[PDB]
Amino acid sequence: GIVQQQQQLLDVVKRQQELLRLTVWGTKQEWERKVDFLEENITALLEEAQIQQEKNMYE
Amino acid sequence: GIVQQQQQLLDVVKRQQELLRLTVWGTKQEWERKVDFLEENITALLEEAQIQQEKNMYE
Amino acid sequence: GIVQQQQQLLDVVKRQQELLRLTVWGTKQEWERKVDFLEENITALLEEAQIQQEKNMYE
Numbered sequence: 001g002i003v004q005q006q007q008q009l010l011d012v013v014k015r016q017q018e019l020l021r022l023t024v025w026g027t028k029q030e031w032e033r034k035v036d037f038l039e040e041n042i043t044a045l046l047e048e049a050q051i052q053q054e055k056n057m058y059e
Numbered sequence: 060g061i062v063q064q065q066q067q068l069l070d071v072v073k074r075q076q077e078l079l080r081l082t083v084w085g086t087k088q089e090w091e092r093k094v095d096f097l098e099e100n101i102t103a104l105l106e107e108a109q110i111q112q113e114k115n116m117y118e
Numbered sequence: 119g120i121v122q123q124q125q126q127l128l129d130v131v132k133r134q135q136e137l138l139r140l141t142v143w144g145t146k147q148e149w150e151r152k153v154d155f156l157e158e159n160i161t162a163l164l165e166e167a168q169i170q171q172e173k174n175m176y177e
Contacts, residue, residue, distance in 0.1 A: 001114070002061050002062065002115055002120050003120065005069075005108060005111045005112060006120060006127075008104060008108040008111060009068050009072065009108060010123075012101055012105060013072060013130050013131060013134070015097055015100055015104065016072070016075060016097075016101060016134060017130075017134065019083075019094065019098070019101070020134060020138065020141065022083075022090065022093060022097070023079065023082050023083050023094070023141050024137075024141050025090070026086040026094075027086055027144040027145055031140065031144055034140060035140050035141070038136060038137045038140070039137070041133055042130055042134060045126060045129055045130045045133065049123060052122055052126060053123060055119070056120055056122075056123055060173070060174045060177065061124060064128075064167060064171060067166055067167040067170060068124075068127050068128060068131065071131050071135075071160055071163045071164060072131060074156055074159055074160045075135065075138060075160060077156060078153065078156045078157070078160070081149065081156070082142050084149070085142075085153075
């Protein structure tokens, strides 16, 4: 149940991430320094969030 | 509990979607071809995610 | 379990919010009127979503 919704929210957020990399791609000195670290933290966070989904889903 | 948070995350993500359509609206050949499919997949994903919330919420 | 993933999704969404404020910062009359209310609703929603995480996490 909640684990299903869990993966749905995680895909909406996965896709929006690609969409943001796009509007940042379109938009594009200190800016591309901030926008860059955020693109890395969110990729890590998306994977930790994925690995976790795989764990809750074993149960 | 988790179902409450579930809907909150789903609304934050619902709103950001409108906000992205806006920065894409402001930003705006192959770009508007990629950015377009993402706007459709995420709308479908937002609805599947909604219909699911309605299911987990019956319990 | 689901409460762990819960906070992960809430941080990915927390970060993307900063990233959007950035592409809106880069992008930037009625536009900055719509984009503004969305930046407020989502901040409120992020906090309600946080306070809620603190509640589900007491259990």
